[PDB]
Amino acid sequence: GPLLVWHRGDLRLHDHPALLEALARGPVVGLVVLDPNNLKTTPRRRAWFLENVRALREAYRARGGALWVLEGLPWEKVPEAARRLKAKAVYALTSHTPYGRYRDGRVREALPVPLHLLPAPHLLPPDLPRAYRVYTPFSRLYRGAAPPLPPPEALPKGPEEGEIPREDPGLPLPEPGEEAALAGLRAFLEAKLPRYAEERDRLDGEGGSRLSPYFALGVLSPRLAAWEAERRGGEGARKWVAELLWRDFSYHLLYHFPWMAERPLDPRFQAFPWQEDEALFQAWYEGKTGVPLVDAAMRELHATGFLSNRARMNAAQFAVKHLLLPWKRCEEAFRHLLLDGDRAVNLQGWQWAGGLGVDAAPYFRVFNPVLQGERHDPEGRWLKRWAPEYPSYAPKDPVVDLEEARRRYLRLARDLARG
Numbered sequence: 211g212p213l214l215v216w217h218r219g220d221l222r223l224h225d226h227p228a229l230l231e232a233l234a235r236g237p238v239v240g241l242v243v244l245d246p247n248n249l250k251t252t253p254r255r256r257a258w259f260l261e262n263v264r265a266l267r268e269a270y271r272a273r274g275g276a277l278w279v280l281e282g283l284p285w286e287k288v289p290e291a292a293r294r295l296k297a298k299a300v301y302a303l304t305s306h307t308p309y310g311r312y313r314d315g316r317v318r319e320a321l322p323v324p325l326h327l328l329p330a331p332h333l334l335p336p337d338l339p340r341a342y343r344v345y346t347p348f349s350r351l352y353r354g355a356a357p358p359l360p361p362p363e364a365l366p367k368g369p370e371e372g373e374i375p376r377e378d379p380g381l382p383l384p385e386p387g388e389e390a391a392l393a394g395l396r397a398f399l400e401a402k403l404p405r406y407a408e409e410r411d412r413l414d415g416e417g418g419s420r421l422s423p424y425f426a427l428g429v430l431s432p433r434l435a436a437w438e439a440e441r442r443g444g445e446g447a448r449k450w451v452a453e454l455l456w457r458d459f460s461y462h463l464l465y466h467f468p469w470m471a472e473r474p475l476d477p478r479f480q481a482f483p484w485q486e487d488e489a490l491f492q493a494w495y496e497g498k499t500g501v502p503l504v505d506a507a508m509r510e511l512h513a514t515g516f517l518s519n520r521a522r523m524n525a526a527q528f529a530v531k532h533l534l535l536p537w538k539r540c541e542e543a544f545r546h547l548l549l550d551g552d553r554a555v556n557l558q559g560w561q562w563a564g565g566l567g568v569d570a571a572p573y574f575r576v577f578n579p580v581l582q583g584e585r586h587d588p589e590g591r592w593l594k595r596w597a598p599e600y601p602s603y604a605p606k607d608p609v610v611d612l613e614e615a616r617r618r619y620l621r622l623a624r625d626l627a628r629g
């Protein structure tokens with residue numbers, strides 16, 4: 211009887227504890243379940259996930275192995291596959307999310323064989339006992355990456371079942387699959403890493419790796435990435451690994467503070483008088499604010515499914531601080547546009563950019579959207595690609611009065627934080 215390897219947000223063969231744990235015991239068959247709880251999302255994200263599942267199947271086939279893909283609720287389909295295959299047990303990487311725990315609990319109940327869950331590779335795990343709200347103390351627990359696990363060589367023969375739907379992303383996807391991811395990683399470490407510290411705050415994000423869409427789906431292990439960067443070493447290297455660690459900090463935060471999906475981490479802000487306003491929400495959402503930087507960011511996001519960190523923090527903070535828009539709606543609309551959209555990481559980013567309690571980032575830091583563009587888009591090349599409407603970073607009939615909006619937020623936030 212084979213062992214089932216159930217891939218979720220780990221669509222790869224390299225550094226995959228569940229895959230190896232299973233293969234060491236006997237023949238394996240891989241499984242992906244196309245779960246409506248994750249797939250009732252935007253076309254771009256459905257297609258990014260589907261095409262990486264397709265790539266993983268190709269990877270299994272190229273090694274002579276079998277990847278099943280079934281559609282439906284995991285607690286129906288996983289036991290289905292285990293019965294049809296006569297599997298002895300199912301292996302998967304632990305998910306520490308509320309839905310991960312719910313789903314895996316229901317799967318374990320419905321399976322008449324063990325579900326063996328192994329820790330996913332991390333730089334630091336999300337579920338350490340100590341809760342940290344601040345990145346520095348959390349980051350000090352990291353002492354360098356453990357070595358990643360090899361991929362299998364050839365995989366054991368088995369029967370393949372199930373179809374992988376072809377869906378329209380509506381935009382150009384990156385090349386899916388771990389072969390493309392690993393090529394991307396090795397090029398970045400070679401060419402860009404040396405100046406990463408000096409170039410990671412560009413509005414165009416061209417100093418960075420552009421690997422988040424692979425990290426989000428586990429197509430690339432963060433442990434392997436951290437290990438490879440550390441073997442490279444030099445100055446870029448420490449700073450880039452620090453950013454990998456921000457990803458793990460985000461999982462840590464949502465794990466210890468699950469209620470931050472509902473309300474600010476900082477309790478002083480839980481009564482902030484946000485101002486719902488359909489028109490303003492839409493102006494922001496569609497990048498029609500009259501603020502060049504913000505409009506460029508949101509138009510790039512709509513068209514591509516990616517945005518640099520420096521653009522994300524400007525676009526997100528503008529909504530929260532300059533527009534006073536309810537953050538939850540904005541957060542969710544933002545995640546749905548992102549190929550790398552990842553609930554914990556996006557929540558972290560929004561609560562950080564919004565001055566809502568992450569990393570004790572102070573309320574009083576308010577981006578000046580013309581200075582931000584001046585500092586992070588040299589000859590204005592980025593503004594020109596994405597909103598050439600605008601001759602400069604100067605706001606052009608902005609949907610709000612920018613200085614008043616600034617003064618208004620700071621007044622409100624000064625009352626709240628210091629009262």
Ligand SMILES: Cc1cc2nc3c(=O)[nH]c(=O)nc-3n(C[C@H](O)[C@H](O)[C@H](O)COP(=O)(O)OP(=O)(O)OC[C@H]3O[C@@H](n4cnc5c(N)ncnc54)[C@H](O)[C@@H]3O)c2cc1C
Nearest residue numbers: 418419420421422453454456457519526550551552556559
């Ligand atoms: C408002 C806001 C929302 C965000 N939403 C998401 C999201 O849903 N999914 C997502 O993957 N990232 C999100 N980010 C984090 C970050 O901006 C992206 O991961 C980054 O832009 C990816 O570009 P890159 O791969 O070139 O990063 P690099 O600079 O090359 O960094 C390497 C990797 O480290 C991680 N990383 C880098 N910066 C951060 C960060 N600020 N926080 C957490 N991890 C980080 C990512 O996994 C990234 O691929 C958000 C940031 C903000 C401020």
Ligand SMILES: O=c1nc2n(C[C@@H](O)[C@H](O)[C@@H](O)CO)c3cc(O)ccc3cc-2c(=O)[nH]1
Nearest residue numbers: 217218219243244245248249255259305310
């Ligand atoms: O196991 C799945 N994971 C999917 N995930 C990956 C996870 O959400 C996965 O369940 C883990 O994130 C939790 O173990 C997706 C992620 C996206 O960004 C977009 C689409 C999906 C779709 C699925 C899916 O159908 N099945």
Ligand SMILES: [Cl-]
Nearest residue numbers: 248250251546
């Ligand atoms: Cl979603």
Ligand SMILES: [Cl-]
Nearest residue numbers: 324325326327
């Ligand atoms: Cl177990």
Ligand SMILES: [Cl-]
Nearest residue numbers: 356357358359
């Ligand atoms: Cl190891």
